[PDB]
Amino acid sequence: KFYIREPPHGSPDWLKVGLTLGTSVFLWIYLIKQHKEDVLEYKRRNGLE
Amino acid sequence: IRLQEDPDPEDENLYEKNPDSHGYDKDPIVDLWNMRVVFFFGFSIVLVLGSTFVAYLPDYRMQEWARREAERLVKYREANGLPLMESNCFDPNKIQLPE
Amino acid sequence: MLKIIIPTTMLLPMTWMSKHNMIWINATVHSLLISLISLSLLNQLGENSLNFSLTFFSDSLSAPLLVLTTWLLPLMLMASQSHLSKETTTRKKLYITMLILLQLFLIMTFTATELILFYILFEATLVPTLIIITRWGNQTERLNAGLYFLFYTLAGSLPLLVALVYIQNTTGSLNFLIIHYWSHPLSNSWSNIFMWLACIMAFMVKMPLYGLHLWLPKAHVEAPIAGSMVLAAVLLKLGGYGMMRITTILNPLTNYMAYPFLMLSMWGMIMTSSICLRQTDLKSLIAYSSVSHMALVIVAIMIQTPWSFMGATALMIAHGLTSSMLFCLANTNYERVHSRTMILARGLQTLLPLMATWWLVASLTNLALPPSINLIGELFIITASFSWSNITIILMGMNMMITALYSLYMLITTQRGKYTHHINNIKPSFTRENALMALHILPLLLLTLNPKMILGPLY
Amino acid sequence: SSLLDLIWLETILPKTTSFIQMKMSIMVSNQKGLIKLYFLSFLITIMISMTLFN
Amino acid sequence: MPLVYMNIIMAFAIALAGLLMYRSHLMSSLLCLEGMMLSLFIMSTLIILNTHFTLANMMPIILLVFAACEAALGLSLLVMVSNTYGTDYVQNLNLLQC
Amino acid sequence: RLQYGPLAFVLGERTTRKLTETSKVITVDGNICSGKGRLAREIAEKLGLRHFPEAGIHYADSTTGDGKPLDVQLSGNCSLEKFYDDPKSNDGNSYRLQSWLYASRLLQYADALEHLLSTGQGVVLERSIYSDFVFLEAMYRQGFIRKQCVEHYNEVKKVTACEYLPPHVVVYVDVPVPEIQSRIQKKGNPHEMKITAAYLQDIENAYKKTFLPEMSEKCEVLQYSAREAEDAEKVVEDIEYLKCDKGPWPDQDDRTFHRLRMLVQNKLEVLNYTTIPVYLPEITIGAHQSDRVFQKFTELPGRKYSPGYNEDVGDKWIWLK
Amino acid sequence: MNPIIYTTLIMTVMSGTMLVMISSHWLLIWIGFEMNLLAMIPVLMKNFNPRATEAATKYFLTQATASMMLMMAIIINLLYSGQWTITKMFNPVAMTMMTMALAMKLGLSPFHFWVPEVTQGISLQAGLLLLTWQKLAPLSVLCQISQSINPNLMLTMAMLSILIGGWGGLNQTQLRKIMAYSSIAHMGWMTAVLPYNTTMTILNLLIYITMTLAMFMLLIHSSATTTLSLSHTWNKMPVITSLMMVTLLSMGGLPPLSGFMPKWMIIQEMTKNESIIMPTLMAMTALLNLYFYMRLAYSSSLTMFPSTNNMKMKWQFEHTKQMKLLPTMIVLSTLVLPMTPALSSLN
Amino acid sequence: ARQWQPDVEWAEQFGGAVMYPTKETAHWKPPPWNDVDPPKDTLVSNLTLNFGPQ
Ligand SMILES: CCCCCCCCCCCCCCCCCC(=O)OC[C@H](COP(=O)(O)OCCN)OC(=O)CCCCCCCCCCCCCCCCC
Ligand SMILES: Nc1ncnc2c1ncn2[C@@H]1O[C@H](COP(=O)(O)OP(=O)(O)O)[C@@H](O)[C@H]1O
């Protein structure tokens, strides 16, 4: 112990950390799925593959 | 006085602590290696290697190519009695003047 | 060009992630490596330019300027590490970051293939320079110097932006290759006169032209040593490069519109040399010598002949190297005695011999001494001006005489005579300062050995 | 050095422009903050826009 | 256009000129501001009644509602100014400068 | 919630609900070397209130980082001992000390108000910002400080102390100046032994003529002599039987308490006007010295980053914080 | 003011602006303007003092006069056309009345004095909300009715705004008055491009709003309302001063920063319409704004002004409240020049 | 032997009510630190009434 008063950010807010990581993972997987669906729809409409 | 101001510090001499100082850093080892890297890289690498690289850069400006082409053209034109330098750059037949 | 651009953007995080005592070493080593890499741009073709991609291209005019910039960065690092010993780590890294950003902007400026991207980059070069001047200048006048520099450049350059967007609307493209191939003559009209004026005036203010040059002594005298080195060596060459680039679409209006600028350049060359004769400040003398040399370059570009452009390119490279070396020498003297007065320190030949040798060589290169590339460029410009008219020889001879006079006046005042008795803190010259002078002077002599590398596309 | 560089090249381009800008800035910013005054200005502007603009 | 519309528009113009020319009192200018909306109400209802725009007959009432909302706002600001200075004179509103 | 703010207020946290009618602000005052400190200790312990010793130099050091005091060059730049030895210094030590002590008292009053509004427990302070000016007048009438220093003090005090609630109880301990000097001589500390009689008299005059008349109008004022102050049982009994409904505390509401709590929990907003651009030679610091001292303070162990993000003092999980 | 009352007043201001921006009826647009003003006055008077009361009084008088003129224009347009839909106005007199009313609401010259007066009078949060949102709404109305705008009147008022903003900002030392004159100049630029490209008007609006939010939030973070108060920020938190310096450089239009994009696009668009004199004058006049931005930058970050002694306690203490989206606004206001072609998405 | 940094003269140059003072602007004064002006000593002037004798 160093500080005379417990700092507000003394320990990680695990709820916020978990929500942040989950939001990042969800956004990345959603973006990958959206890009795949966009490529498939573009190919289907233009009659490429 | 109008402020609580520091006095102007005395000039710091690098030779006082380190008599054999190269003038790069206060730390002796850091200063020595700064001198070494500067001298090695700059002088040796850049100067010598870049100078020989520029000296032996290939003839991409086609100076010698132009000279050989000129030699061939002069030989051919003086062998056949043609003028060495043509009067026109382009073909007057291919040029169509206005009426 | 990415093989050179990306290493600078990697110099940035390396500078910010290196240790506190290793920033100078790492920056110098990797700047020298980047310069060596950029030495490969000198292999140019005789027919056309090096068109790497749709965005960047290199030419016999851009290549020497890029090599000069990449070589100038580590010398600036050496001088900055000289004068920034007591700074904090964060501020040292910020200064190095400003230098790196300036080099990156200059590289992209010299290699930009469109006029609007070139405008954006050559205007972006102002911010790091202004920050450097007004933040790490020593005296009070740095703020006024920065204001003058910024406002001169911007008041010159904004009509250039308007003219560039107008030209894009009229012709369809600002790509340099397209505007060179699809160029059409400029008829004698008021609108064309003012378009020519917008472009030429922007680059003339950048040059600077005589009568538009006060910002140059203001900024050069009051900027730190690295800022002074970059201002004279490279930042003055943006105007000449731009004029040699834009004048493709400004014909035949350049035959008639160039008279006032030619007269200003010649007479102000004479006047600034005479001013150099009577300068009580060494930095001001160097700055006015720079003004005279760039006035000669302006004369070359305005007369606009294949012999004038080669001389302009050679003189620009030579002036960059020589002015950087002179500023470094004057800065070492200032770091000795903490004053810029020329007559304060005397007998410096008997107090510091090898620095006297460096001063002698720098002064001999400052005046046109054969076979130096300074003389090569000046002689080509003088011959082209002679073909233009036969009294330009009178003006050029007067300028050469005054140039020799003030160069040797500076040398004799600073180095010869008897030393000042009460100045007793002139320590022996450092290995770092001697190496800085050697790295300034040797490439100039090697360029003298091989002169076709700096004679431009017209060679 | 003195007459041209330090006096007249400074007087013509940079100093005169700065003086004009300072004078205009003082003129614009020198207001007593009176709603009566600048609402009279509003009335004049409205009349001018109605009449002189068609 | 008939002369009735001319008179109503002239009344609006007069009330607008009155507001733009203060004398001493803020209350007098508030009264000038209230008259402009009265002229607007009269003009709007004269136009709507003449063209038999049946569904537009509710517009003047909304106009009156927001008119008296503005009047309430002006009265509140006037009481605050009068508490601050002792009079509703607009000369006292000079702390802020342009 | 989880931190006081508008969200907590709209959730329903109310200061009036939190209070227990024993939440009182009591300030004990007196001349130099009185029994005011011991009286405050006894009153605080008997009434179960939190005691706040006098806010001298390094109080902010005690409340931030680790409780240990920092260097005088980094916290305060003033010396009470030097003020005693050479009161008429040419470096502005006297007014630097006075302004720093006023800022420290302002900080302590903000802390006490925050504690009272967040816990409901009363606070007994050994001195307040309302009593601080007596030493300013004592310095001014003795020629120690200047009229410009007094004017700057008045401006800062106005714009700062105009925003807080006066104490519920003001307890003044009256001790005659000869007795003050006798106690000083008995204590034997040389610097305070150098205190002159006129300086002590000016403090008492300021207390008697300005502070006590000013505090009487706002709320109750209790005055005791040495013997009366020594017997704290009667003092606490007198406090417990005080009838008063003319103070601003009864007029305070939930919204006013919300605004006051939002103000006092923000320590940088409390000290906002303690540094106003008034360039007195006593309190102004040059650019170079300011930069050097700021660098030294940042080089202090647990001061480079925020409290939760200082690895050198044993903070882990920084990369996930 | 109760927090619930404050948030409901903010919601009502936003409701009025959204009603203006979604309505297709002139009466509903006027209703939105009235609701916005009615809920905006107490926001100005939130921190009660004579200066705030005077600022609110001046703002109310100006906006009430503008609303009266706007309703008169609506009625006159209805008389000659019988139409309530917001389209190209059918009467030139009504169009002139509407143009003058919307210019007065925006603060375009010569209807500008209330902008510096009120901005100085009110606090920093009130000034931020005022500038941003109260420019957001009338510009929407003008963009809707652009095709009937008189180019001469609009460009005259725009150039006057640019010149007057430059000169006023040159003279001022107060940060709020400086921000107000900057707002006047930026509104001038936007309304100058308005009669040609409402897309460029919207682009300039977005960039100006981002830069203004960043600057105001930096001022709130530093709690500085004057030049000398800002001169002490380098001794407490030097990062904020550097961020303010780069934001000031961006607001001056210096490349390669975000502030150059609106000026560049507007100059290009006006050049496409064979306008050269106006773009050149507008480009040259902005150097005054750049000058006083640079003067502010000299005092705050590029030089070190003297500090005081209680700054040591300020060092000891840490900032509590966290600004929301401040880093995002600082990044978006300086480093979005390479993302210029997104204005097509804005189209 | 050190970089010049602004002093009290520079700060007082930048610390006026406005830049570029004139006579009127010199008569002007900067606003209060907390934007709260001192209250004015206005007189309530209560109505005085004679209740009686008639
Ligand atoms: C459309 C959404 C717009 C934004 C809505 C939210 C605004 C208020 C919240 C952000 C406040 C500033 C950011 C820094 C907060 C620091 C305090 C902290 O610890 O925050 C933790 C937080 C993660 O918390 P968590 O709840 O997990 O977030 C995911 C959602 N549940 O950490 C963070 O939130 C940090 C990352 C924030 C993301 C960057 C900001 C939004 C950018 C969106 C992309 C578009 C960029 C341009 C925006 C303008 C144009 C649209
Ligand atoms: N504003 C002030 N200016 C100068 N000195 C002060 C100030 N406030 C307190 N002091 C000094 O701090 C000390 C406070 O202790 P004191 O009042 O003697 O009570 P105690 O005897 O219980 O310690 C005194 O020596 C006093 O001189």
TrEMBL record, chain A:
One of its GO terms (cellular component) is respiratory chain complex I. It is found in: Mitochondrion inner membrane. It is a single-pass membrane protein. Keywords: Electron transport, Membrane, Mitochondrion, Mitochondrion inner membrane, Respiratory chain, Transit peptide, Transmembrane, Transmembrane helix, Transport. Accessory subunit of the mitochondrial membrane respiratory chain NADH dehydrogenase (Complex I), that is believed not to be involved in catalysis. Complex I functions in the transfer of electrons from NADH to the respiratory chain. The immediate electron acceptor for the enzyme is believed to be ubiquinone. Complex I is composed of 45 different subunits. Belongs to the complex I NDUFC1 subunit family. This is NADH dehydrogenase [ubiquinone] 1 subunit C1, mitochondrial. The gene is NDUFC1.
Automatic annotation (TrEMBL), chain B:
It is a single-pass membrane protein. It comes from the Eukaryota. Residues 1-22 are annotated as: Disordered. One of its GO terms (cellular component) is mitochondrial inner membrane. Keywords: Electron transport, Membrane, Mitochondrion, Mitochondrion inner membrane, Respiratory chain, Signal, Transit peptide, Transmembrane, Transmembrane helix, Transport. It is found in: Mitochondrion inner membrane. Its main location: mitochondrion. The chain crosses the membrane at residues 37-58. Complex I is composed of 45 different subunits. Interacts with BCAP31. Accessory subunit of the mitochondrial membrane respiratory chain NADH dehydrogenase (Complex I), that is believed not to be involved in catalysis. Complex I functions in the transfer of electrons from NADH to the respiratory chain. The immediate electron acceptor for the enzyme is believed to be ubiquinone. Belongs to the complex I NDUFB11 subunit family. This is NADH dehydrogenase [ubiquinone] 1 beta subcomplex subunit 11, mitochondrial. It comes from Sus scrofa.
TrEMBL record, chain C:
One of its GO terms (molecular function) is NADH dehydrogenase (ubiquinone) activity. One of its GO terms (cellular component) is mitochondrial membrane. It comes from Sus scrofa (Pig). The gene is NADH4. The keyword rRNA processing does not apply. It is a multi-pass membrane protein. Core subunit of respiratory chain NADH dehydrogenase (Complex I) which is composed of 45 different subunits. Keywords: Electron transport, Membrane, Mitochondrion, NAD, Respiratory chain, Translocase, Transmembrane, Transmembrane helix, Transport, Ubiquinone. It is an enzyme of class 7 (translocase). Core subunit of the mitochondrial membrane respiratory chain NADH dehydrogenase (Complex I) which catalyzes electron transfer from NADH through the respiratory chain, using ubiquinone as an electron acceptor. Essential for the catalytic activity and assembly of complex I. This is NADH-ubiquinone oxidoreductase chain 4.
TrEMBL record, chain D:
The chain crosses the membrane at residues 33-54. It is found in: Mitochondrion inner membrane. Belongs to the complex I subunit 5 family. Core subunit of the mitochondrial membrane respiratory chain NADH dehydrogenase (Complex I) which catalyzes electron transfer from NADH through the respiratory chain, using ubiquinone as an electron acceptor. Essential for the catalytic activity and assembly of complex I. This is NADH-ubiquinone oxidoreductase chain 5. It comes from Sus scrofa (Pig). The gene is NADH5.
